[PDB]
């Protein structure tokens, strides 16, 4: 005969019960703007790299000093 408390509470409840809507709204929306940094993890990477390769390590001494021998 009506639209009621009973039905309004039904709608309210259903809203509360729907996990898909609210969880998707929070998680999927927040998922997209996720990331911006010059990561320190990559600072580690870079530093290690610096330590990594003979072309820096040996050559820095050997090209520089064996220039002048005598």
């Amino acid at each position: 005969x009506x639209x009621x408390x009973x039905x309004x509470x039904x709608x309210x409840x259903x809203x509360x019960x729907x996990x898909x809507x609210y969880x998707x709204x929070x998680x999927x929306x927040x998922x997209x703007x996720x990331x911006x940094x010059x990561x320190x993890x990559x600072x580690x990477x870079x530093x290690x790299x610096x330590x990594x390769x003979x072309x820096x390590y040996x050559x820095x001494x050997x090209x520089x000093x064996x220039x002048x021998x005598x």
């Binding site: 064996x66 220039x67 021998x69 005598x70």
Partner: protein, 185 residues
């Protein structure tokens, strides 16, 4: 065994021939050894910069001029024969007395080592040391020395007298290789 001082270092045959180019380009003869060392202490114009045939630029000090001195002093790879010049004057003093002036005049050099600029000069310095200064001295240093031999050979080929002189197949038939050693010098 020099080069490892600067210690860019490689040993194999092809690597050794790579040096030949440097021997073309980078060498020149020491005018005076002590004085050169003094300049070596003073200056880097003595030092020149050169590329790998491909790869690096390489730049070389006294190591260039030190090399020819071996001819004058074969200590550096060590032997005794008192060297080119002292050998020469020795071999002169073997040969007899009167001729000598001519040779003092007529002094001749050729080919691979001689290519270096300056050898004749220090040679003359050496002879002026060893000669009695009183008498004329000079040396010949033609441009073409490295070819000289084959050129002379061409001349040698030209004269008909070798038709008198050649070996022929016939002798090789009738007598062995032994033929040569009588027949040729």
């Amino acid at each position: 065994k020099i080069l490892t001082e600067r210690g860019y270092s490689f040993v194999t045959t092809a690597e050794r021939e790579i040096v030949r180019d440097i021997k073309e380009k980078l060498c020149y003869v020491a005018l005076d050894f002590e004085n050169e060392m003094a300049t070596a202490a003073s200056s880097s114009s003595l030092e020149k910069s050169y590329e790998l045939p491909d790869g690096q630029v390489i730049t070389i000090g006294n190591e260039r001029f030190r090399c020819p001195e071996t001819l004058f002093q074969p200590s550096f790879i060590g032997m005794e024969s008192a060297g080119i010049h002292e050998t020469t004057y020795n071999s002169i003093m073997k040969c007899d007395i009167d001729i000598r002036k001519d040779l003092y005049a007529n002094n001749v050099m050729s080919g691979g080592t001689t290519m270096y600029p300056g050898i004749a000069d220090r040679m003359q310095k050496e002879i002026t040391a060893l000669a009695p200064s009183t008498m004329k001295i000079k040396i010949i240093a033609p441009p073409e020395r490295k070819y000289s031999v084959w050129i002379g050979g061409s001349i040698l080929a030209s004269l008909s007298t070798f038709q008198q002189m050649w070996i022929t197949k016939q002798e090789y038939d009738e007598a062995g290789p032994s033929i040569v050693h009588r027949k040729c010098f």
